[PDB]
Amino acid sequence: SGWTFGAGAALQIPFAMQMAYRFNGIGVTQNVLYENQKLIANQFNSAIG
Amino acid sequence: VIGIVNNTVYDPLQPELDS
Amino acid sequence: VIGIVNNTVYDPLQPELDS
């Protein structure tokens, strides 16, 4: 649900769309994440590992 | 983009500039 | 809307697309 569950009822949203929201939140246009979705997911996965 | 969908994106200018 | 006011909203395109 992203951050919505903290403010009220949890509203579901696809995770990549939530990541696009958050990329907007730091001043990067969402097309950047949609174009680097796989690279970003791999970077996150390796960071967790 | 993964998840992109085929649809029309309307243009306000096109019908107008024809006039 | 409560408080709305009657006025003109100019359009930059209209004089131009005439040309």
Ligand SMILES: *[C@@H]1O[C@H](CO)[C@@H](O[C@@H]2O[C@H](CO)[C@@H](O)[C@H](O)[C@H]2NC(C)=O)[C@H](O)[C@H]1NC(C)=O
């Ligand atoms: C941006 O930097 C990332 C670093 O994470 C690059 O991803 C790596 O690219 C090299 C060469 O293709 C690969 O050998 C690595 O395995 C990649 N790392 C991961 C985590 O995938 C990415 O190619 C760079 N992109 C640009 C535009 O330079």
Ligand SMILES: *[C@@H]1O[C@H](CO)[C@@H](O[C@@H]2O[C@H](CO)[C@@H](O)[C@H](O)[C@H]2NC(C)=O)[C@H](O)[C@H]1NC(C)=O
């Ligand atoms: C989201 O995931 C679903 C799977 O739950 C995808 O639906 C599948 O789409 C493929 C197309 O290659 C079909 O072959 C599968 O049979 C579908 N699964 C079912 C049971 O519907 C859906 O396309 C995915 N969409 C996005 C946006 O990722």
Ligand SMILES: *[C@@H]1O[C@H](CO)[C@@H](O[C@@H]2O[C@H](CO)[C@@H](O)[C@H](O)[C@H]2NC(C)=O)[C@H](O)[C@H]1NC(C)=O
């Ligand atoms: C959106 O429309 C394009 C066509 O403008 C589709 O691309 C076609 O895909 C079909 C089936 O895969 C092919 O038979 C055509 O040859 C393709 N044409 C072109 C110009 O690429 C595309 O698949 C459509 N996407 C969706 C999600 O409907």
Ligand SMILES: *[C@@H]1O[C@H](CO)[C@@H](O[C@@H]2O[C@H](CO)[C@@H](O)[C@H](O)[C@H]2NC(C)=O)[C@H](O)[C@H]1NC(C)=O
């Ligand atoms: C803001 O409040 C004032 C009153 O303090 C409104 O003025 C009155 O408007 C009504 C009709 O709208 C008249 O019948 C009264 O005689 C007016 N009072 C005076 C003394 O001018 C004003 O219209 C309100 N405007 C907004 C934006 O709410």
Ligand SMILES: *[C@@H]1O[C@H](CO)[C@@H](O[C@@H]2O[C@H](CO)[C@@H](O)[C@H](O)[C@H]2NC(C)=O)[C@H](O)[C@H]1NC(C)=O
């Ligand atoms: C803004 O203009 C409209 C007209 O375009 C006004 O509506 C008129 O109101 C007068 C007086 O109440 C009536 O005599 C007319 O019949 C109305 N005409 C229409 C088309 O509605 C409206 O009152 C104006 N508003 C302000 C705040 O001046």
